[PDB]
């Protein structure tokens, strides 16, 4: 239904090694499709997905061009902030950029993003209306005042509402047989006894795409939240995802708990209950 | 596609 495209830029100064490390990547939904790494041989934007390879060489040229510009703007940015935060040239600092856009099932614009971070904190970001900036502190107030005078908002907006969206739609069609797929989770439950007293019920969801899932435990059909462990959704390596939820349980009361699984690939949600 | 607009901070 909903879809996104997002580019992610990280640049980290290597004082002494001079040239800062710069890595850019690009995603459609939860599938990565392009990368650029300042330390790689190719010095071009590389493909990280079959479907984008079909794009012709005008494309690859044009993205390599743009990404180099990104790399440049960041190398400079690193120094600018160094001075704004009155820091010295002996420490390694990190600048991060993220932008992209989102569309409904209609494939129309919903939201756009443009945001910066310096050393793991917010720096500056474009508000949701894409007409104005949020300056995280005093330092970034300076970048705000500048980008206001230079009518940056208006332009970036037009990219995010316009260009960004069209390219997503294209990527989606071109990668229809991958990006537009709904891989429903394979689900099982396991039982491991810690004592004669308690026992752990673990509810699994494997081989699913996209990564957006929900697993909740329900005691007697009431949301049981308390004696609960829930691992971070994790990537399986082959483009699918994994998650599990756990409840430790008074033994004899095993069939009092049910695992509930919601995912876009399932017609109806799933209810799973330990079967011996 | 990346954007064509890039501004320094």
């Amino acid at each position: 239904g909903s879809h996104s495209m997002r580019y992610f830029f990280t640049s980290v100064s290597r004082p002494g090694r001079g040239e800062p490390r710069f890595i850019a990547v690009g995603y459609v939904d939860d599938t990565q499709f392009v990368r650029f790494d300042s330390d790689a041989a190719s010095q071009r934007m590389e493909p990280r997905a079959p479907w984008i390879e079909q794009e012709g060489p005008e494309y690859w040229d044009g993205e390599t061009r743009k990404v180099k510009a990104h790399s440049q703007t960041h190398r400079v940015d690193l120094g600018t902030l160094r001075g704004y935060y009155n820091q010295s040239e002996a420490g390694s600092h990190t600048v991060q950029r993220m932008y992209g856009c989102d569309v409904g099932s209609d494939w129309r614009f919903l939201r756009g993003y443009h945001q910066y971070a310096y050393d793991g904190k917010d720096y500056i970001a474009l508000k949701e209306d894409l007409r104005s900036w949020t300056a995280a502190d005093m330092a970034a107030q300076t970048t705000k005042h500048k980008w206001e005078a230079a009518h940056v908002a208006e332009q970036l907006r037009a990219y995010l509402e316009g260009t960004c969206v069209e390219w997503l739609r294209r990527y989606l069609e071109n990668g229809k047989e991958t990006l537009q797929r709904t891989d429903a989770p394979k689900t099982h439950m396991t039982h491991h006894a810690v004592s004669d007293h308690e026992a752990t019920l673990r509810c699994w969801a494997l081989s699913f795409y996209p990564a957006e899932i929900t697993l909740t435990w329900q005691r007697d059909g009431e949301d049981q939240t308390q004696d609960t462990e829930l691992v971070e959704t994790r990537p399986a390596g082959d483009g699918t995802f994994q998650k599990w939820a756990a409840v430790v349980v008074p033994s004899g009361q095993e069939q009092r708990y049910t695992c509930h699984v919601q995912h876009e690939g399932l017609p109806k949600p799933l209810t799973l209950r330990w079967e011996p | 596609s990346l954007s064509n607009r890039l501004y320094y901070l």
Partner: T-cell receptor
Amino acid sequence: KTTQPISMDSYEGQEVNITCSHNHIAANDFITWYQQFPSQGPRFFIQGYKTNVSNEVASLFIPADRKSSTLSLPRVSLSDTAVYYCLAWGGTDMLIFGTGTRLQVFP
Amino acid sequence: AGVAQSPRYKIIEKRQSVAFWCNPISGHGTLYWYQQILGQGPKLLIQFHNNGVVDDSQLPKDRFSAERLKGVDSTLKIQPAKLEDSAVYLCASSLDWVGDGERQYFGPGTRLLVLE
């Protein structure tokens, strides 16, 4: 891509109107016109965005939907005889000049 | 202020070397080499910012090459030349190659004619 007439003739003292065609213009792209005289390099002439613009050398009429644009030399001199290139681009984007429109101003 | 290039004209035999020179506007950090085949407009060959190549994806590396080792004057060079390289070689400079869209300042060209 811009698309424009290959050549255009005119008499001195008239208003001249060259039409650029840019239907697949990107939403942040600007409309920009270089002028090249014979045996010189191209020089920047007029640039516009989304609202009509006129400097002290020409006028750029830009419709709302920006599928086409029109350059308007107000009253041509023989000295205005030159190629007029029309670009629709922005920021870090290559210039793609094309064929231009060779204007000729007869006396 | 204008961009300067040397020379204005150059006649050369097939398979020989030739070299154009350009001095950008003082301060302009991005320089460009274009090729203008007769009756077309200029197409980009190579783009420098300071002393480094930002774009060369379209340059014929078999024969063309360029330099801007101090980030100011530049030198484009064909070797060995072919007949079809007969063109005007234009040079341009920009303050930067990023932002809203930067106006380019061109030099007056070097006319190259390669003969059999």
